[PDB]
C-alpha cells in the first residue's frame, strides 16, 4: 500500500498506489477496395438493365 508519483497543482493532485507487484493499408490499397465495391455495384446494375432490356 505505497503511494508514489504524487503531483500537486492548484486544480488538484494525482498519484499511484501499488498494492502488489506483478508476477496498415496504404492510400492506394484503400482506393482499390473502394473502387472494387463500386465495380460490383456497376456490374449488378448492368445486369439489372440487361434484364430489363430483354
Amino acid at each position: 500500500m505505497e503511494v508514489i508519483e504524487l503531483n500537486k497543482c492548484t486544480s488538484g493532485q494525482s498519484f499511484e498506489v501499488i498494492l502488489k507487484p506483478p508476477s496498415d493499408p496504404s492510400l492506394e490499397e484503400i482506393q482499390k477496395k473502394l473502387e472494387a465495391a463500386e465495380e460490383r455495384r456497376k456490374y449488378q446494375e448492368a445486369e439489372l438493365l440487361k434484364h430489363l432490356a430483354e
Binding site: 486544480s11 488538484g12 493532485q13 494525482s14 498519484f15 499511484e16 498506489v17 501499488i18 498494492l19 502488489k20 507487484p21 506483478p22 508476477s23
Partner: peptide, 13 residues
C-alpha cells in the same frame, strides 16, 4: 499476473 496490482488516481478539485 503480468500486470501490477495498483491504482492510478487523479483528483480534480
Amino acid at each position: 499476473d503480468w500486470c501490477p496490482t495498483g491504482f492510478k488516481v487523479g483528483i480534480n478539485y
